[PDB]
Every structure is written in structure tokens, then in C-alpha cells.
Amino acid sequence: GSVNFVDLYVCMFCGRGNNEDKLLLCDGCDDSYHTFCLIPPLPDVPKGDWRCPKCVAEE
């Protein structure tokens, strides 16, 4: 709901020598997740806008 400090770029413990250069960031949530970090039907880096699990449920 607020990010006075930069935390909006986090995700699961994933990331060690991982694909994070493709890590997806939602509109303005602290819900950034890798394609494969969700149940993924999605891996193709979206050029447009992608929604976090929360957002897709209620939007």
C-alpha cells in the first residue's frame, strides 16, 4: 500500500543465478513475480502490462 523505501522489486527466495532479468513487475504492487514463480502459462516476457495474482483475481 506504500513504499517509502524501494522494496517493490522483490520476489520469492528464487534468484540465485536465476532468470530474474525477466522478473515481472505489476502496475504498482509489491507483488513482482517471475513468470515461473506463479503457476506459469505465461513465460514469454510480456511487452505490455502484466497483473499480479492478486490483481488478476480482483480487477
Q: Per the structure block, which three cell numbers stand in for 7?
A: 522494496
DSSP string, 5-16: SS-TT--SS--T
Q: For residues 27 and 49, is the Cβ–Cβ distance under 8 A?
A: yes
By rule CB under 5 A, what string of x and - marks binding of each residue 28-57 to Zn ion? Answer: -x-x--x--x--------------x--x--
- From the list 11, 25, 38, 42, which residue makes contact with Zn ion (rule: CB under 5 A)? 11
Query: Would you say 29 or 42 has its CB closer to Zn ion?
Result: 29
Q: Report residue 41: phi and psi, to 5°.
A: -100, 0
Site for Zn ion, rule CB under 5 A? 11-12, 14, 26, 29, 31, 34, 37, 52, 55
